Amino acid sequence: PTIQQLVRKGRRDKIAKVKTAALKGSPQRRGVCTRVYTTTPKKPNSALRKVARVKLTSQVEVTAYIPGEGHNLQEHSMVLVRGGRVKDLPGVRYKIIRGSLDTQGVKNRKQARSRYGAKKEK
Amino acid sequence: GSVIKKRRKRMSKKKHRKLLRRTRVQRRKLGK
């Protein structure tokens, strides 16, 4: 535009959408697992993804994905959720950390253990 | 251009005008 049009109005930058709004500026956030269930992915994929409806201390109800081979999560479980988006399930934007609070590390795991909360067997 | 764009716009406008016609008396009752 004209330099006078720029003087009168100026440049207003675009707005930056908030990412992971339920964490409220925190890396991790604790919650109680209100429900555990399984759901089916989109068109070209086929599995039983393990998800959990949890209630964070932000007083926000969210869905989190449970990674690994297996888990022992039921209702009323202290879980620690963190960021992370899996493309396969459109609704989920959070993942439950394996190896903290009531969430156990996967069993018989011996590669990339840290990301799955497994101790180094001696 | 392409008439698909005008087609989408016309369908949305048509649905909204139909909805407005369907709820005339109720809207007059509430607004008054």
Added chain:
Amino acid sequence: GKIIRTTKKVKAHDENGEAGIGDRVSLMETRPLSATKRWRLVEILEKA
């Protein structure tokens, strides 16, 4: 980077009520005379 022209309002003291509306005058900055009054009329410079 453009040059911008802007205007300001000043309240000044003249004892004898000489200068009228539309005149061109010189002003000098003094102690607070009242609430929002800090300038004095040195001498009227151009009539109108």
Added chain:
Amino acid sequence: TMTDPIADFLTRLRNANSAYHDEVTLPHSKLKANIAEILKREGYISDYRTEDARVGKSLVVQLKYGPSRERSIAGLRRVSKPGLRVYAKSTNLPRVLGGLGVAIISTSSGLLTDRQAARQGVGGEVLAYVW
């Protein structure tokens, strides 16, 4: 209406150049005559002169080409235009083509080249770039 006689001068010169013309006729101005003199001194135009026209004077600039018709001036642009005006210090003078061009600058001493202004240590308004 006419808002920028200097930019009109530059663009008439440019358009006449790109079509391989030899003479350019212009309304006369003192600043236009000074620009034309600075251009002639730097070997960008063949010559320039003034004539009496029917109302005011007129300025005629004779362009210069090479042996195989190579245009002498490669580019003309207006920097400080009405609206946004450009002023430069004596220690931030611009460089055109890394120094191979000429930047006309109006200072209080008169109309100078960027190297002339840098040597004389003055600054002013950057009228145009010619190269």
Added chain:
RNA sequence: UCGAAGGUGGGAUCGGCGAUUGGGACGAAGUCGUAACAAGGUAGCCGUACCGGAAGGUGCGGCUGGAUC
């Protein structure tokens, strides 16, 4: 005299819930039709008005981002 806290009164403003109710987005598999794209079998679309289970139909004015002459 001024004066914090308190009492009484009518408004202003910003939010949560709400029986019932409208539209929107997405879903492995459902029912009804065939509206647009080739002159899509009545050219399509724009503003407006009426009508119809639904896409939609018709009147008035406009456009070519319409095929053949």
Added chain:
RNA sequence: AUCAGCUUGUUGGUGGGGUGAUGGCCUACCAAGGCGACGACGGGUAGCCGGCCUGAGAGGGUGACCGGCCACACUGGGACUGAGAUACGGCCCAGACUCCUACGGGAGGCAGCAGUGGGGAAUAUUGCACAAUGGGCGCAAGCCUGAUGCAGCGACGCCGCGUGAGGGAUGACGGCCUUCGGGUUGUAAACCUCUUUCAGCACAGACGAAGCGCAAGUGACGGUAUGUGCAGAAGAAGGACCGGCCAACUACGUGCCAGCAGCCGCGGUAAUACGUAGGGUCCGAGCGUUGUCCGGAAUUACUGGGCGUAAAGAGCUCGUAGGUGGUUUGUCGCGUUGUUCGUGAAAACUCACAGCUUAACUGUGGGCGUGCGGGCGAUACGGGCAGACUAGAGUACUGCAGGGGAGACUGGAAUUCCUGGUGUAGCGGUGGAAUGCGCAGAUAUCAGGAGGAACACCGGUGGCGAAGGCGGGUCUCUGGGCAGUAACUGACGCUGAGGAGCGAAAGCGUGGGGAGCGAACAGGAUUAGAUACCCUGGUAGUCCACGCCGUAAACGGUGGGUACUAGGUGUGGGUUUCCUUCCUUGGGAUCCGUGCCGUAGCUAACGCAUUAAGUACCCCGCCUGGGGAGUACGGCCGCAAGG
């Protein structure tokens, strides 16, 4: 601004009061002022800065440590003492809370240093000492100092070092592949020498103290850093990744299951992509994951973007504030520019030097501190003041073309209806029919009459209008444009946020009018069904007067003003020169419109191309992935529809 008005000690004056001091700081009287579309008055949020992170820079994010200023001390209000008070460890009052009471009354304020509970993903010891620096009191010794100097806990960050070095086979096993030959781990391991870094065990032991003291003493750190010895490699390695982006492959198990994943995407009997093994690559006391900010993003484009068809020119004009401005003379020195002086704390950054065994770290000395103010110089450009000019703009005189607009009267063809002759059994309609109209006299053919609407031929890419739009004839009233002369004014120009006016058709109100056509509504036909296309009827409407609404593919999907950049050829309006036959588009010259083709130039392409989408200057409007949505909420307008 989905907050346009705000203020009544409010703006000024006077006489008093008050203060350390000016002042509506306060009071009595008088005048009616003061602020605001450069955003007053409202709502939300936030301690400010030197600096820090990122970035080529401009810019964006930020205010942790260290330093400066401000504000506060359980919440609200108030004053006393002094030179000095938000008076954290002061006072008074009113609240909420905690504790004692003999019931009459009393006592408290860790957002000081430690510490507890709670919240949380998460942040430390109920340590030593005034030895040094700083402070208060005192003549002095001296006393006080959770300021400060140190210490402990936390890989929380930056830096440095160690878990060993030499030689050792055409290179032991074992694991894993194998093409069943063999290869990788791999000089790696085992083996013979070596030195001990740091820890371990002993001995000595600081600087910080030209200190303090008028008494012979004086170090918290500390028996610490550090040196000299003691036998010994003796006590010391894990984390990610291996489809491609990107350093690095094979076997086995699972088969759309279990599962992976930043993008595209891998798994259904050969997976280098899932999981486990051998191998490899990148880092190494760290390695990965999540969150936040910047970059890449020229993706808000000042540097540094756009609007024919990709998102983007308001439907069109007039005009307010504002932005911008033709040639020329003198002056000011506001913008601009030069020089000099003051300031820009320290720390931080950069350059150089120096110090701790190096480093991180520290000190010293320059620069940086990109700005502001004071004095002095310049006057090209922009601007102010005072003049001048006619080339822009407007007016004047004479001619030109036109469906430009408003009112009134008026003409003919044709359709329908009515009245009357002739006349008979059909007419109408369709791909074919049937509803329908007739035989109670239709259609058809003549004569007379009533009424309403649109104006054949001229008539086209031809004229006029800002757009929307405008042609039967005549009369009256009225707006704009063009050319010629150049007598007149002398820059009076351009654009225009908001605002106002005009604005096809449909639609709305009141009152008329109603031939034809025809939404809705009835039948008939087609069809699997036909709320349609086709056929027969047919109300609102179309029409007139006066007002509303304010939208269109309101399109050239192309805002307005100005200057310049090869040409060829149709057409509308007007002036002039040469042949003149003196008629004819006789030819040329020039001004203003309207089409086609075409270079140079531009564009992703199509295409534009002197009527630009080329080359440049001024001003406005608009754009920032597709949907949700031009929708909801709030507001304004309208009778309503709705905008």
